[PDB]
Ligand binder design. Structure first.
Ligand SMILES: Cc1ncc(COP(=O)(O)O)c(C=O)c1O
Ligand SMILES: *Cc1c(COP(=O)(O)O)cnc(C)c1O
Length: 226
């Protein structure tokens, strides 16, 4: 039951924030609806969920168009999958956020294809903080340079960072890795304007990510099942 699952996830988030001395309002729940049908999303919407993450362009755009045509206003759609050049126009025209900026050319493409009447596309730069096997994300040493270039793009808005850490079961390593992201995030925040989003944490490392300084967790299975 999606409505019950949303309540359960929101409870765990709230507890984790409170335990480490943070206001639960600091933590945004991104409901990851990848591979789930639009009816499942509609249940979540009926239960008050407004922010949804999708990983595949056509699937996500089809959902966006569905809920726009039902005249459901007030939603926020985040693209959190890897972005290919030949599918960036659909992201630029329909999504509100994109978490996976890891090369300048894809951000310039998104900026160029974003209609001017839309709000700027909110973007995070994705860090590969700890995953040997992944080809997504930049190294931290590239961040200052990429952030400067992306920051000039007028149809985008740089809001912070995202990372998918390598899968990790030891709480200690979950926290230490998430802290590396939080340190980078804080350093970015002191020099850049409107840095407010650290997209970090899924169901299995939610507590360490929140304790370390995440502002946004990405939950799929624990909301929608599998
Ligand atoms: C269900 C579904 N919809 C849409 C797409 C669109 O693909 P892409 O993520 O490359 O944009 C994919 C395939 O990757 C998909 O699996
Ligand atoms: C799919 C995915 C999630 C959610 O995964 P679950 O294990 O089902 O909770 C979160 N973030 C990203 C980037 C994902 O691709």
């Amino acid at each position: 039951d999606i409505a019950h699952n949303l309540a359960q996830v929101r409870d765990k988030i709230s507890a984790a924030a409170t335990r480490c001395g943070r206001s639960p309002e600091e933590i945004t729940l991104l409901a990851v609806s990848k591979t789930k049908p639009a009816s499942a999303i509609a249940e979540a919407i009926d239960a008050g969920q407004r922010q949804f993450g999708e990983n595949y362009v056509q699937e996500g755009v089809d959902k966006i168009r569905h809920f726009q045509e039902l005249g459901v206003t007030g939603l926020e759609w985040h693209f959190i999958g890897p972005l290919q050049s030949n599918k960036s126009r659909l992201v630029a025209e329909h999504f509100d956020w994109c978490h996976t900026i890891d090369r300048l050319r894809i951000a310039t493409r998104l900026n160029d294809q974003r209609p001017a009447e839309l709000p700027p596309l909110n973007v995070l730069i994705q860090i590969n903080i700890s995953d040997e096997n992944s080809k997504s994300g930049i190294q931290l040493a590239e961040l200052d340079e990429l952030a400067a270039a992306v920051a000039e793009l007028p149809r985008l808005r740089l809001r912070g960072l995202m990372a998918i850490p390598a899968p990790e079961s030891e709480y200690v390593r979950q926290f230490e890795v998430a802290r590396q992201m939080a340190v980078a995030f804080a350093g970015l925040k002191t020099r850049y304007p409107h840095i407010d989003t650290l997209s970090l944490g899924m169901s299995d490392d939610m507590e360490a990510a929140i304790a370390a300084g995440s502002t946004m967790v990405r939950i799929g299975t624990a909301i929608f099942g599998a």
